[PDB]
Chains A and B, each alone.
Chain A
Amino acid sequence: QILSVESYFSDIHDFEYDKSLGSTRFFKVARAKHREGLVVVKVFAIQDPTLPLTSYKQELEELKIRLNSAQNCLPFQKASEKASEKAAMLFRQYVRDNLYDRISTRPFLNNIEKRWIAFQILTAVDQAHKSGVRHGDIKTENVMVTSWNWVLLTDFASFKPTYLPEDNPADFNYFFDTSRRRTCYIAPERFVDGGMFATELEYMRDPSTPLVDLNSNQRTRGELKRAMDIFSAGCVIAELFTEGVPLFDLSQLLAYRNGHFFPEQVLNKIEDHSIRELVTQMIHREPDKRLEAEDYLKQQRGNAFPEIFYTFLQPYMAQFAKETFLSADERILVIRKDLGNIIHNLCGHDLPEKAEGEPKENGLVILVSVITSCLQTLKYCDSKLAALELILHLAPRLSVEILLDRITPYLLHFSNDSVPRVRAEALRTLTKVLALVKEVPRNDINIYPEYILPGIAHLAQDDATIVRLAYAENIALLAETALRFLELVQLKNLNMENHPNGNYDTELQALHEMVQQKVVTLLSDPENIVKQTLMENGITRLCVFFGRQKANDVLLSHMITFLNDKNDWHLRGAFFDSIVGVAAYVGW
């Protein structure tokens, strides 16, 4: 109990996490406590050395006032409450997924609407805490983590010693901690740094390495929390998103004291007036000019979007309540979000066409991925229904978008292979996916079927749920449509290239011959599984058949695929003849 994986503990803990020291502030640490066995990354602190101040009374009350409201921000489950002598460890969940870290972790997730959605979820928290007055707060990606509902749950701990980038596809780079200061890449405040002191503490003089060289603490003055100081900090975390990299240079900081800098605006949507102007409003002089989160909101690029936000925010508050009961959400949410659809991007008959022109109702809904990630959590077969409903609800995920989406589905055939007729659910969905007509972004897309499907077909040998197999021979032509869709990349690959003498036109076809030789392998491996199933008129063991006389059922459906392997009519004919000979005896 009192120790755990460190002698340094006073209860059951999983691990020690990272430590750090500010230039603007003192030391800090992270800790992953297995409280009730549940391992969660709480704040580290010792009350032993902090007794002299214990000023925290106020801080704990403002915590109580703030944590009271479970909005799009992060309320801690017991933070204020978790002070003690050897262990003042402010309680929090398993956080270490800082924000730019998460962004570079899934560029697969990074998307036009998504960035804007994330940004807008943060914006609601900002305007709310300004109203529920907690003015003048600092910002960096240490302040946030990414939930299963993709909510930017904003905390109040802007140093996160657990923080940097993540899954960056281009890289050959050394470590980068302390990048423009004594810790992680900060967001400067022009009045704090360039005016008084970049430091938080009181004094009456002017150090450098922690920063005060600007002025003598105005001869013993305190902190002065204002909205203008908040606009300053927000402005620096934003550009990091846009450039994918921060703006923090000492030259840039001298230029910020000068109120005029060294821009190199790296994105057209960012220099797009929509984004450029309000950023510039933050940039000129935060108190001297004006920047208003309000002005920003009123002037949302599309004013449709604020409304799309706040309308569906009502559901997001229901999401914050859902921390009570997930399975209940799944199924009643099906009921509710029939209406949700009929409100938002309504189709009259609840099966959106996945390619409805240049979208006639204008959908690009990254929020389906939001909800998907919530509903990944295991509960009840309630889920089966909503998935089938979703298959029918063939909303406009692109080929690629549907493909991104395609991560969990077969993953859940696998995850509930135990219920054999989950195979039947998945059948319908994959048949639907196949029936959808779309373009393959890359050649390799089609190969993963050609290996995925093999794996799942072994699972078919584990238990033969017949329904899946019956559809197989049909959507065999649709998997050949996946090969047509691959051949569309062959059209794109052609779009990347620009008889008696023994001409050279063979070079144009020859690689497609080898591709076809490959696809013939992909006829042969079915021909293997098929000949095994063809001898397996029952799943056969110790002179007994698990009665795959059901082959006669699937036999009608089979004509679709039967065209494909047929030319070794010798081989097919022999196996079928062996079947005929016995059927002629046993079968009526």
Chain B
Amino acid sequence: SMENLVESKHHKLARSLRSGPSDHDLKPNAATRDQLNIIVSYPPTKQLTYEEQDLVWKFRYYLTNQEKALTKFLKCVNWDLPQEAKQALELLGKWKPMDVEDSLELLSSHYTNPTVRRYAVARLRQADDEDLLMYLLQLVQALKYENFDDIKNGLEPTKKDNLEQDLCTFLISRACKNSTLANYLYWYVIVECEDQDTQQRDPKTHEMYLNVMRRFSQALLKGDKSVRVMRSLLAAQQTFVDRLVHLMKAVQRESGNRKKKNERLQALLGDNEKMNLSDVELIPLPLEPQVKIRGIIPETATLFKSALMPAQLFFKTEDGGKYPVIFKHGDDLRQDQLILQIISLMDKLLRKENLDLKLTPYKVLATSTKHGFMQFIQSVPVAEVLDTEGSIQNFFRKYAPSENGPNGISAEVMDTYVKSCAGYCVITYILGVGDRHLDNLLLTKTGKLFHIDFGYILGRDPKPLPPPMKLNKEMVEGMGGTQSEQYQEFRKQCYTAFLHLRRYSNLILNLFSLMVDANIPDIALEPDKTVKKVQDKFRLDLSDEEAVHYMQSLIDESVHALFA
């Protein structure tokens, strides 16, 4: 049953499909090649066939030549037989150089073969700070690495008691090249050193990862220059923050009323926080590896009055200025750290397309032991700001009388608003944000829109939920009047925007294919449905701007919504 009957099939299938294709190399002949050029130009998701795989296993010359087509063929094969491996490693060299983009797909667990992994590093050989943006998603891909850690465990822990194959020195050569990519990446890594006892307990391999992080620290420190000890020291100084958040866990425990806890905090921070903040020698900021602290002012220090204990404080830096900051401690904030990071990646591509969404990517990181910190925010969070004002128009006029409601002309406040609004709807289409309300709506009076509730995603709401668009009946006041101008400008910006992201988000499909290996809740069910849903939701299947007409009908239905 799972006996020779199972294998018999495999042979008959191996014969003719193997042995036939791969022979003495020459160029493809027929005009079916022109049709096939279209067929191969099918996107990443477009998984290959039992017969199409065979065709490429024939048509090698054009595949060699089309420098970036190689990957589609690499999707077809596996390194099942040494004879396969032989032709595969032959052709690895033969093929006109692969795309550094398409180099991401081949690092997947699909292709366990070291030579591929070694050569993919050459395909994406550019040791540059672009990797820092890649650090916004790569951790789930890095989760497919817990095999070679046991191999390199033979080496890295042992020895201390550019052209290369060693991914760890690809890492060292690229990352140690910049202090940001060393230290901030280590703090990012500290979020995975957190809870490593479960990855030791269920897997065992987190103990190997603890050895790995130890041996990376050894590999850096053995570099033996001022730079190498200094980065080891700045981590140590930043680790004092862990002591401070344990003290802040104790201060949180001595609660009273909002004012009584605030007084206890202001007093305890007055002695302890002023002394420690002044005491530390130029350890860097959470928002910036370059900014460094030289004080904290316990006077203006305040708190969000909620169980997460979000902080609101200001730090007299080495640079003189009193930088605003926020911590959240006693929360595994990984849902938000990943979301803001991916947002940053999307924002980079979107800025490569010259549209800025005016959203605030606030920095977030972890120093040690599940404690963490982030960039602070100034806000006007609710419909109550607009209700304190006379209307959406009166709200503009009050704050910025250049706008002066309808009677003035607001310039960039309005421009930033319209281009921002045209951005925020696109973000809501893709991310499927949940639990939106009139109280999750930080209208910065300057033109910067902040809709904010990203923690609920993939439509997480009880049954009725927020739309893929970004509009409500309050905005329907101002926008219904400024329909001719602002709704059209909204409509034109978003129309042009989607059409540009339809160009090049194919690489995000590769990123998605690796970054999907992360922690985000209920992922036990969602994957295959999600990959299909993404391609369908943005209907890459149908590049018809009539879909925007369908969406514009939904927009009509949105103003209609009291009866639609």
A: which residues have CB within 8 A of B? 7, 19-21, 27, 94, 106, 108, 148, 167-179, 207, 209, 373, 376-378, 404, 406-408, 411-412, 415, 444-445, 447-448, 451-452
Contacts and interface: CB of A to CB of B under 8 A. Distances in A.
Interface stretch (B4-12, B231-239, B399-407): B4-12
Given A177-B528, A179-B532, 16 more contacts: A94-B2, A169-B52, A170-B52, A171-B47, A171-B51, A173-B45, A173-B46, A174-B47, A174-B531, A175-B528, A175-B532, A177-B532, A376-B5, A378-B4, A406-B12, A415-B4
A366 B211 CA distance: 59
B509 to A, nearest CB: 9
Contacts of A404: 12
Given A167-B50, A172-B47, A174-B531, A411 B4 contact: yes
B398 interface: no
B524 interface: yes
A169 B50 contact: yes
A419 B47 CA distance: 44
Contacts of A27: 525
Contact of B525 (A7, A21, A373, A407): A21
Nearest to B43: A174
- A-B complex: 5 closest residue pairs judged by Cβ atoms: A174-B45, A171-B49, A169-B51, A376-B5, A407-B12
Contacts of B52: 169-172
Contacts of A179: 532
B533 A178 contact: yes
A177 B531 CA distance: 9
Given A444-B16, A447-B20, A411 B8 contact: yes
A171 B19 contact: no
B1 interface: yes
B48 interface: yes
A424 to B, nearest CB: 20
B202 interface: yes
Contacts of A377: 1, 3-5
A172 B4 contact: no
11 contacts: A106-B9, A108-B13, A170-B52, A171-B52, A172-B47, A174-B46, A175-B45, A376-B3, A376-B5, A408-B5, A411-B8
User: Which of A27, A170, A415 has the most C-beta atoms of chain B within 10 angstroms of its own C-beta?
Assistant: A170
Nearest to B531: A175
Given A177-B528, A178-B533, A448-B19, A168 B8 contact: no
Given A378-B4, A404-B12, A411-B8, A177 B529 contact: yes
Contacts of B54: 169
B61 interface: no
A148 B12 CA distance: 17
Contacts of B529: 177-178
Contacts of B40: 172
Nearest to B45: A174
Interface string B403-432: 000000000000000000000000000000
A146 to B, nearest CB: 11
Contact of B49 (A108, A168, A175, A447): A168
A441 to B, nearest CB: 11
Nearest to A415: B4
B535 interface: yes
A171 B55 CA distance: 12
A452 B15 contact: yes
A249 to B, nearest CB: 14
Contacts of B43: 174
Contacts of A207: 463
B550 to A, nearest CB: 15
Given A407-B9, A448-B15, A174 B532 contact: yes
Contacts of B535: 174
B203 to A, nearest CB: 10
Interface in B8-36: 8-9, 11-13, 15-16, 19-20
Interface in B524-547: 524-525, 528-529, 531-533, 535
Given A376-B4, A448-B16, A451-B19, A170 B49 contact: yes
Nearest to B535: A174
Nearest to B51: A169
Nearest to A404: B12
A412 B7 CA distance: 11
Contact of B532 (A21, A178, A209): A178
Nearest to A182: B529
Contacts of A448: 15-16, 19
Task: For chain B, give the interface size range.
Answer: 35 or more
A173 B47 contact: yes
B127 interface: no
Given A173-B46, A177-B532, A20 B525 contact: yes
A172 B1 contact: no
A172 B75 CA distance: 11
Contact of A408 (B4, B463, B525, B528): B4
B39 interface: yes
B42 interface: yes
Nearest to B41: A172
A130 B160 CA distance: 75
B42 A172 contact: yes
User: Which of B5, B39, B45, B532 has the most C-beta atoms of chain A within 10 angstroms of its own C-beta?
Assistant: B5
B276 to A, nearest CB: 41
Interface string B445-470: 00000000000000000010000000
Contacts of B528: 175, 177
B531 A407 contact: no
Interface string B273-313: 00000000000000000000000000000000000000000
Contact of B4 (A19, A171, A412, A447): A412
B410 to A, nearest CB: 42
Contacts of A108: 12-13
A445 B15 CA distance: 9
B49 A169 contact: yes
Contacts of A167: 13, 50
Interface in B462-481: 463
A444 B18 CA distance: 11
A179 B531 CA distance: 12
A176 to B, nearest CB: 6
Contact of A407 (B8, B46, B463): B8
A373 B1 CA distance: 8
A453 to B, nearest CB: 12
Nearest to A170: B49
A447 B19 contact: yes
A373 B5 contact: yes
A210 B531 CA distance: 21
Nearest to B19: A451
B42 A378 contact: no
B530 to A, nearest CB: 9
Nearest to A109: B9
A465 B12 CA distance: 26
B65 to A, nearest CB: 20
Contacts of A169: 49-52, 54
A96 B9 CA distance: 17
Interface in B488-541: 524-525, 528-529, 531-533, 535
B478 to A, nearest CB: 32
A27 B524 CA distance: 12
B1 to A, nearest CB: 5
Nearest to B20: A444
A94 to B, nearest CB: 7
Contacts of B3: 376-378
Contacts of B16: 444-445, 448
A170 to B, nearest CB: 5
A408 B4 CA distance: 8
Contacts of A406: 12
Contacts of A376: 3-5, 8
A83 B410 CA distance: 69
A411 B7 contact: yes
Contacts of B11: 407, 411
A510 B267 CA distance: 99
